[PDB]
Amino acid sequence: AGGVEHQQLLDLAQKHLGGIPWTYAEDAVPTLTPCRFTGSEIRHRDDAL
Amino acid sequence: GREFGNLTRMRHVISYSLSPFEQRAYPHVFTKGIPNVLRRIRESFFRVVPQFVVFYLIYTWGTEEFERSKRKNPAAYENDK
């Protein structure tokens, strides 16, 4: 953002970021989950503070 | 002057916990509870029971002795004559 013109940034991006692999190596896929929320608590001390 | 902020100094003793709703009221009862109650009772035995057994002995002996003197009293009249 700022003084950048979009098409310059894109045409420039093609010459450098285009070398990044796109098809997954080993076809790896991350496995996200709707993770749980515990009701626990932690209570560290050090009374001199 | 013994409110919780006024109590003893203590330092880095971290403690972990859980919500009551997050955990069941009776965990591992069959596997961990009963054997625990058993080791407790096994510790309690010899320190407690035998003296009560001595009470049972003095009790039965006293009852048998009173009942003996009482009903052998006429029998004491019998050996008397």
Give B-chain residues touching A43 at CB under 8 angstroms.
14-15, 17
CB distance from B6 to chain A under 8 Å? no
Spatial contact of A36 and B18, defined as CB atoms under 8 Å apart:
no
Give B-chain residues touching A45 at CB under 8 angstroms.
10-14
Element (H, E) at A11: helix A6-13
The number of folded domains in chain B is: 1
DSSP B21-80: GGS-SSTTIIIIIHHHHHHHHHHHHHHHHHHHHHHHHHHHHHHHHHHHHHHHHHHHHHHH
- Domain range enclosing B41: 1-81
**CA-based torsion, A7, A9, A12, A14: positive or negative:** negative
The residue behind tokens 């626990």 is: A40
Element (H, E) at A12: helix A6-13
This structure's resolution (angstroms)?
A: 3.4
A40 contacts: CB under 8 Å, gap ≥ 6: B16, B17, B18, B19, B22
**Which chain B residues in 18-47 lie under 8 Å from chain A, judged by CB atoms?**
18-19, 21-22
B10-21 b/e with 16+ CB inside 10 Å = b? eeeeeeeeeeee
Experimental method: cryo-EM
The residue behind tokens 């050996």 is: B79
Q: What is the CATH number of the domain that holds B58?
A: 1.20.5.210
Pairwise CA distance, residues B2 & B11, whole Å: 19
Element (H, E) at A13: helix A6-13
CB distance from B4 to chain A under 8 Å? no
Q: Shortest CA distance to B18 belongs to which of A46, A7, A41?
A: A41
B11 contacts: CB under 8 Å, gap ≥ 6: A45, A46, A47, A48
